[PDB]
Write a protein that binds this ligand. Sequence first.
Ligand SMILES: CN1[C@@H]2CC[C@H]1C[C@@H](OC(c1ccccc1)c1ccccc1)C2
Ligand SMILES: CN1[C@@H]2CC[C@H]1C[C@@H](OC(c1ccccc1)c1ccccc1)C2
Ligand SMILES: CN1[C@@H]2CC[C@H]1C[C@@H](OC(c1ccccc1)c1ccccc1)C2
Ligand SMILES: CN1[C@@H]2CC[C@H]1C[C@@H](OC(c1ccccc1)c1ccccc1)C2
Ligand SMILES: CN1[C@@H]2CC[C@H]1C[C@@H](OC(c1ccccc1)c1ccccc1)C2
Ligand SMILES: CN1[C@@H]2CC[C@H]1C[C@@H](OC(c1ccccc1)c1ccccc1)C2
Ligand SMILES: *[C@@H]1O[C@H](CO)[C@@H](O)[C@H](O)[C@H]1NC(C)=O
Ligand SMILES: *[C@@H]1O[C@H](CO)[C@@H](O)[C@H](O)[C@H]1NC(C)=O
Ligand SMILES: *[C@@H]1O[C@H](CO)[C@@H](O)[C@H](O)[C@H]1NC(C)=O
Ligand SMILES: *[C@@H]1O[C@H](CO)[C@@H](O)[C@H](O)[C@H]1NC(C)=O
Ligand SMILES: *[C@@H]1O[C@H](CO)[C@@H](O)[C@H](O)[C@H]1NC(C)=O
Ligand SMILES: *[C@@H]1O[C@H](CO)[C@@H](O)[C@H](O)[C@H]1NC(C)=O
Ligand SMILES: *[C@@H]1O[C@H](CO)[C@@H](O)[C@H](O)[C@H]1NC(C)=O
Ligand SMILES: *[C@@H]1O[C@H](CO)[C@@H](O)[C@H](O)[C@H]1NC(C)=O
Ligand SMILES: *[C@@H]1O[C@H](CO)[C@@H](O)[C@H](O)[C@H]1NC(C)=O
Ligand SMILES: *[C@@H]1O[C@H](CO)[C@@H](O)[C@H](O)[C@H]1NC(C)=O
Ligand SMILES: *[C@@H]1O[C@H](CO)[C@@H](O)[C@H](O)[C@H]1NC(C)=O
Ligand SMILES: *[C@@H]1O[C@H](CO)[C@@H](O)[C@H](O)[C@H]1NC(C)=O
Ligand SMILES: *[C@@H]1O[C@H](CO)[C@@H](O)[C@H](O)[C@H]1NC(C)=O
Ligand SMILES: *[C@@H]1O[C@H](CO)[C@@H](O)[C@H](O)[C@H]1NC(C)=O
Ligand SMILES: *[C@@H]1O[C@H](CO)[C@@H](O)[C@H](O)[C@H]1NC(C)=O
Lengths: 129, 129, 129, 250, 250, 250
Amino acid sequence: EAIVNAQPKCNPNLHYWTTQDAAIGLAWIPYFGPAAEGIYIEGLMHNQDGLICGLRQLANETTQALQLFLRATTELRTFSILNRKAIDFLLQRWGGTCHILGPDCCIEPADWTKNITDKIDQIIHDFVD
Amino acid sequence: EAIVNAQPKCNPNLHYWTTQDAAIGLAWIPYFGPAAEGIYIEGLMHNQDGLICGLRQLANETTQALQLFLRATTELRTFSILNRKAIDFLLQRWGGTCHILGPDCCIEPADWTKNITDKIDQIIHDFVD
Amino acid sequence: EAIVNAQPKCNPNLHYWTTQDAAIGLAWIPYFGPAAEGIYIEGLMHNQDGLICGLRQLANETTQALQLFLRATTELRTFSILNRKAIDFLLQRWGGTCHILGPDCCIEPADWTKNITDKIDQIIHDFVD
Amino acid sequence: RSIPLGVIHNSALQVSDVDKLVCRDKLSSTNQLRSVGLNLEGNGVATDVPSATKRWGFRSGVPPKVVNYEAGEWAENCYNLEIKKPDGSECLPAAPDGIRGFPRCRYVHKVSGTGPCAGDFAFHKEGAFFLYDRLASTVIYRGTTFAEGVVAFLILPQSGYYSTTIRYQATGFGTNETEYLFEVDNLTYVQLESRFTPQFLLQLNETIYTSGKRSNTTGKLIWKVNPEIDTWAFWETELSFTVVXXXXXX
Amino acid sequence: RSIPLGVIHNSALQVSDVDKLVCRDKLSSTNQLRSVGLNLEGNGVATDVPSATKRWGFRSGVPPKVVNYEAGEWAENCYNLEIKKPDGSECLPAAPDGIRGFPRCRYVHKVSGTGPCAGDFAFHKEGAFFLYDRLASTVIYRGTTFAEGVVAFLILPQSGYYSTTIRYQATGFGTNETEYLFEVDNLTYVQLESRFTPQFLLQLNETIYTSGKRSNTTGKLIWKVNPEIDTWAFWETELSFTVVXXXXXX
Amino acid sequence: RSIPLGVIHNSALQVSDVDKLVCRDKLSSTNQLRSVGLNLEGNGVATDVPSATKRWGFRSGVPPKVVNYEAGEWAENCYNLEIKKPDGSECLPAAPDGIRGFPRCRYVHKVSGTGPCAGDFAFHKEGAFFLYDRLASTVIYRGTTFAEGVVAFLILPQSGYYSTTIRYQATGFGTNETEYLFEVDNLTYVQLESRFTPQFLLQLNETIYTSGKRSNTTGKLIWKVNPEIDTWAFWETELSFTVVXXXXXX
Ligand SMILES: CN1[C@@H]2CC[C@H]1C[C@@H](OC(c1ccccc1)c1ccccc1)C2
Ligand SMILES: CN1[C@@H]2CC[C@H]1C[C@@H](OC(c1ccccc1)c1ccccc1)C2
Ligand SMILES: CN1[C@@H]2CC[C@H]1C[C@@H](OC(c1ccccc1)c1ccccc1)C2
Ligand SMILES: CN1[C@@H]2CC[C@H]1C[C@@H](OC(c1ccccc1)c1ccccc1)C2
Ligand SMILES: CN1[C@@H]2CC[C@H]1C[C@@H](OC(c1ccccc1)c1ccccc1)C2
Ligand SMILES: CN1[C@@H]2CC[C@H]1C[C@@H](OC(c1ccccc1)c1ccccc1)C2
Ligand SMILES: *[C@@H]1O[C@H](CO)[C@@H](O)[C@H](O)[C@H]1NC(C)=O
Ligand SMILES: *[C@@H]1O[C@H](CO)[C@@H](O)[C@H](O)[C@H]1NC(C)=O
Ligand SMILES: *[C@@H]1O[C@H](CO)[C@@H](O)[C@H](O)[C@H]1NC(C)=O
Ligand SMILES: *[C@@H]1O[C@H](CO)[C@@H](O)[C@H](O)[C@H]1NC(C)=O
Ligand SMILES: *[C@@H]1O[C@H](CO)[C@@H](O)[C@H](O)[C@H]1NC(C)=O
Ligand SMILES: *[C@@H]1O[C@H](CO)[C@@H](O)[C@H](O)[C@H]1NC(C)=O
Ligand SMILES: *[C@@H]1O[C@H](CO)[C@@H](O)[C@H](O)[C@H]1NC(C)=O
Ligand SMILES: *[C@@H]1O[C@H](CO)[C@@H](O)[C@H](O)[C@H]1NC(C)=O
Ligand SMILES: *[C@@H]1O[C@H](CO)[C@@H](O)[C@H](O)[C@H]1NC(C)=O
Ligand SMILES: *[C@@H]1O[C@H](CO)[C@@H](O)[C@H](O)[C@H]1NC(C)=O
Ligand SMILES: *[C@@H]1O[C@H](CO)[C@@H](O)[C@H](O)[C@H]1NC(C)=O
Ligand SMILES: *[C@@H]1O[C@H](CO)[C@@H](O)[C@H](O)[C@H]1NC(C)=O
Ligand SMILES: *[C@@H]1O[C@H](CO)[C@@H](O)[C@H](O)[C@H]1NC(C)=O
Ligand SMILES: *[C@@H]1O[C@H](CO)[C@@H](O)[C@H](O)[C@H]1NC(C)=O
Ligand SMILES: *[C@@H]1O[C@H](CO)[C@@H](O)[C@H](O)[C@H]1NC(C)=O
């Protein structure tokens, strides 16, 4: 379904920080590198396609399922949410037999079609004696 | 192989508990929700297809490999057993080149067969001049 | 790229230990089994194909990316490096639609080719009236 | 070895693994992967405190290990141990953060007492696990309710709760000279034997209270049941008191 | 339920999951999977200490839980709590190993004081999370800077930093009779109200210092702002002092 | 950057990643994925205590980090540090739960002593790791045997053990004025130099014992080896004593 922001306000700009930083010399060595306060890069995203106000509503609506997931897990949890999403993605497409030209099989025989029906003109065209 | 229950007795019924519970109002909020004792749902499984007595023997026979796995891992283990099983499942089927009509390739070209041999009657049937 | 050992020396032999050990009787039971010092098996690898000197240089060159990965993660890390590599491997091959005979699709229609062009001699050979 | 996996084929449970399935086998979601904890109770093991404690022992040099499991079985008998050495130090480690007791126990057999505890950790002598709240361990944690059991891993195809605490005192725990007493109150005890069921212990407790057979002094009173009194698995199912500080309940 | 996933379709953000994508949807790397922490600030919640603390409460019987997130939002208002019970014991647990404060805060509202703290852990009454350094928790940790917020999970398609600490004293924390004081120095305080913004508090602090309105004795001096003094969300934007130990700032 | 992966192609080891393999490359099991710990020893680094300790240093503001590895290399030289500050407080943190010493060490160089320790944690100055039992850390743990080394990640294609502890005393640890003494007994020491090999230290210890060169009083006796005494990497390979409390071993 779509995302309907129902919050009292929306800050349309996302001034964000992350740690997804080529290192400069020996800065990668923990002994010489930055302190914990200096490992962050910053960025600024605007509300193009309404993605920021949609993101704020998405995080708000994620909470119930997230809290119910955390209640059901023990704090000795041994799996990551995003890795399990990646595994479930692959299991949805490839967890069973892929029936070609089916709705649940992500196999396009496009070039394989115009490689057979293209090369029929090697047996029907060469029918001379 | 099959599962042969070799236990002195078998309780054929599994009165089980789990935490795989639509929430009721604000019950998902940890501040308002249930205590740790009240997060469990219960169920009762009977020995249809001998699954319960087979399950008891399976858990018994799993112990050696499970203990040997736990001895070889450090208690800082960073991977889950079931996620790794899911990954190994996909690697077994899709970890290499899928040779169509092979025994290790889970690709059924069924409808793709009766889409070519069906549509041969567009070139062999239309051979008029 | 290739691995160029640029170390002052290389020990060409790898006298290694690991815990990848059929158990002997009740030795799998932790109460009866070995102590922590006795769970290791040993092996000796020689420098065939220069793999040992290449391995020493590889571990040396892995450090920067490994340290930068560890700086960016919190010590509450919930995913394993090798499982994520396995997932990324599958996502690279099967994360999208597999176009048959494409460069990024690992589907070989070899036997499927010589099952159609082989069985054309059931309709072109049987054209009698 | 490799951890076996339970899969349903031909209307029967079979042991297999992800590397020996066929293309017909369809695993389309991690929801089909399940870990279950099964109680040793269900296999017919003796559950009384004397019999159960004989299956545990102390060992050093082996670090404890822990594995998750998602679903468990309602237990009739659980155990909760508070054992010390004669010098007063604790025999069992405190439960790590986030390890709660087994969640479904009809009878929790709480055992307090002493023993030499010749070992850093208490392990299961038969290789089984100690089942806590969705967590299986190789060792016993102090004052934490557990059920003995084992774990299975499955590929699935695409009723009020009451708990009663039964308290015991123990001497010589761990050794082959262990003695157990069933605690009626802080000064009235019954010498315990293997044949006493939880139901018999609760009725003996109710009989002693209503009949005034509790100790009415400051000293310790221990009752003995005469062998002439007696009354399968848990799922398939005129007293005279005179003192002889020992005594006899006929 | 199942944890929702944000995906971009038709130039708009939509909620979906990995089980309801189409073959056109291409996930070729875990780099496309991202967790983000969004601050309640961005939704228009009141951020003053009186309003913010009303959203938190103490509860027992619920273990704390923690989830990772990779990217977060620069916060204008964060909070750092040092609350004790009247008997002197700590109300909040020490931060677990490796949990650092929220990394980007323009104003850290440090609140020290007392309260009954009728509960083992402090939770968010509206179900939100307390955002620390790339870690979201259900409970508040002692002396650890946090921002209130929530977490979203996404599938992506294939400017100096200054922080100012604003210190408060609190009585009756948690109850519905909580009192707050803004600390100018260890002996000069201002009775706090919800309408005071961080910018107004810093200018009131600079005015009190330069005008010599700090306490020049050993006793405690508390200023009150008269309601005649006053001056939207954070992103869209002649004083007389006489003492009446209370006083008034007109 | 992205963590590199070792793969065998054309009878040679190459660095690559899962995103730059070809369809011919077959990864059919996680068993083909392996992490290995390689010792700095194998690259030809000086392993004596003076040389090795110069590669470590104390730093604050950087949290420690830890990564698993499955297989390791037998080490000739390991290290085990017990360093305190002059005020008696510990310089190094206790090993976290489940971190055991490196499992294969021919010589464990145990170093006790003092130093300023101007930093919360001791890091490797060259960016290497400290290898423990199947666990690599960025910092040194107290009294825990480690080998210096680095970790590699691989895609595989589809002999008695003896350990000897060599004890040292150290002053000015961490600084550029560090002094080391080889401990023969609790009252007999040898002033240590970089050129002394483990084999030379063990023979010097056996010579001092059998020749009665140990201290026979209550005071401290320190021997010095004269530079005229001397005797490659570890894998490719008439004494007069008079006292001058210093002394000389010619
Ligand atoms: C191509 N990028 C551009 C626009 C979409 C894609 C993703 C990125 O923005 C992400 C984002 C995630 C976390 C922090 C900052 C930006 C994004 C995805 C969905 C909705 C909003 C932003 C910038
Ligand atoms: C369709 N379900 C039905 C019958 C097979 C399938 C699986 C489920 O039972 C599971 C189960 C797992 C854990 C707790 C309780 C039930 C099950 C699988 C294999 C063997 C026995 C039970 C009930
Ligand atoms: C078939 N094996 C043989 C040779 C290649 C393959 C892999 C194995 O050696 C591994 C190894 C890994 C960790 C410890 C010891 C051996 C190996 C892979 C790459 C480079 C060197 C060794 C031995
Ligand atoms: C009410 N319960 C019942 C059915 C839904 C809810 C959850 C519980 O789930 C069972 C189950 C097994 C097979 C099919 C459907 C539900 C279950 C047992 C063990 C582990 C997970 C789920 C049993
Ligand atoms: C400098 N930053 C900028 C671009 C590279 C570096 C890393 C950061 O990455 C963003 C991003 C989003 C979408 C496309 C490219 C970069 C980013 C935000 C949140 C989480 C991860 C990455 C923003
Ligand atoms: C006896 N060892 C020998 C062979 C089986 C057992 C286990 C060990 O395994 C090696 C190995 C490498 C390549 C092929 C087969 C075995 C091994 C080294 C490092 C990490 C895992 C395994 C070596
Ligand atoms: C498994 O069952 C057998 C036979 O009942 C028993 O001897 C063994 O101890 C059991 N294993 C465990 C781990 O309980
Ligand atoms: C059992 O206890 C007796 C003491 O009466 C002792 O002699 C014997 O060694 C014990 N047996 C074992 C196996 O410990
Ligand atoms: C019984 O003894 C225990 C152990 O000291 C004590 O905690 C408990 O309060 C006592 N109960 C009564 C009723 O005396
Ligand atoms: C024993 O009986 C008394 C009397 O009602 C009761 O209060 C007590 O709980 C009983 N003990 C147990 C273990 O049930
Ligand atoms: C006093 O205690 C005894 C047990 O020592 C008990 O049997 C007796 O009933 C009590 N007194 C009376 C008058 O019943
Ligand atoms: C989500 O937004 C609604 C409406 O603003 C609000 O009532 C609710 O408390 C929010 N949920 C969380 C977890 O903040
Ligand atoms: C609010 O505080 C008053 C004290 O004046 C008290 O009587 C009342 O019960 C409180 N309300 C709540 C909901 O706690
Ligand atoms: C103010 O009081 C705090 C709390 O006791 C104390 O730590 C601090 O040193 C004091 N500052 C001054 C300037 O007195
Ligand atoms: C209040 O003003 C004084 C005067 O410069 C300054 O030192 C102090 O940091 C200010 N307090 C805050 C919280 O900014
Ligand atoms: C002394 O303190 C008072 C506040 O109690 C302050 O207003 C006054 O300015 C100070 N003294 C002088 C001479 O200003
Ligand atoms: C890798 O090798 C180079 C050259 O020998 C050396 O300078 C560098 O310190 C090494 N890196 C690590 C992490 O040991
Ligand atoms: C080395 O030690 C000397 C003391 O003799 C000191 O003066 C000098 O600063 C030190 N060098 C470094 C780099 O610390
Ligand atoms: C040597 O000194 C150490 C450190 O105090 C001590 O633990 C050890 O017992 C001593 N050994 C002898 C033989 O005196
Ligand atoms: C030194 O020699 C004595 C004499 O045998 C021996 O007991 C001791 O272990 C030796 N020390 C070392 C470190 O080998
Ligand atoms: C007594 O100790 C000295 C060292 O101070 C040693 O060289 C000497 O051999 C010992 N005494 C005798 C008689 O050897």
